[PDB]
Amino acid sequence: TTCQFLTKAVLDNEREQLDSPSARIVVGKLNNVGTGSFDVLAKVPN
């Protein structure tokens, strides 16, 4: 019930921390599941 939950969010001055799968799809953020559950770094010499 989109507008109801929205009304509730506004009146709470809520922050969407963007952790749920739904929220991340909304904002275009890579999902928190899966191959996304860790970071990759490169070992560089010199």
Partner 1 sequence: PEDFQQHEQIRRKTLKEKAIPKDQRATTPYMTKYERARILGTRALQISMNAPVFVDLEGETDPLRIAMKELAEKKIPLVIRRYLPDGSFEDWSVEELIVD
Partner 2 sequence: ARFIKKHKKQVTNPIDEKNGTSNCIVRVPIALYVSLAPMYLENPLQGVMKQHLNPLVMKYNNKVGGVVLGYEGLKILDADPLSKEDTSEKLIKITPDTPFGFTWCHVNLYVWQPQVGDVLEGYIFIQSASHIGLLIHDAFNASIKKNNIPVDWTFVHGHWVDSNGEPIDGKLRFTVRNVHTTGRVVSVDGTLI
Partner 3 sequence: DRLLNSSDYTQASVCRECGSILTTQQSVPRIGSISTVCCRRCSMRFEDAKKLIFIDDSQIWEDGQGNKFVGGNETTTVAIPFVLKYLDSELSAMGIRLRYNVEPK
Binding-site ranges for partner 3 (CB under 8 A): 6, 10, 25-28
Classify the phi-psi angles of 30: left when phi > 0, otherwise alpha if psi is within -120 to 50, otherwise beta. beta
40 sits near partner 1 (criterion: CB under 8 A): yes
Classify the phi-psi angles of 28: left when phi > 0, otherwise alpha if psi is within -120 to 50, otherwise beta. left
Q: Tokens for 20?
A: 């749920």
Q: What part of residues 4-33 is at the interface with partner 2 (CB under 8 A)? A: 30
37 sits near partner 1 (criterion: CB under 8 A): yes
* Residue 27 contact partner, candidates partner 2, partner 3, partner 1, none, CB within 5 to 8 A by sort of partner: partner 3
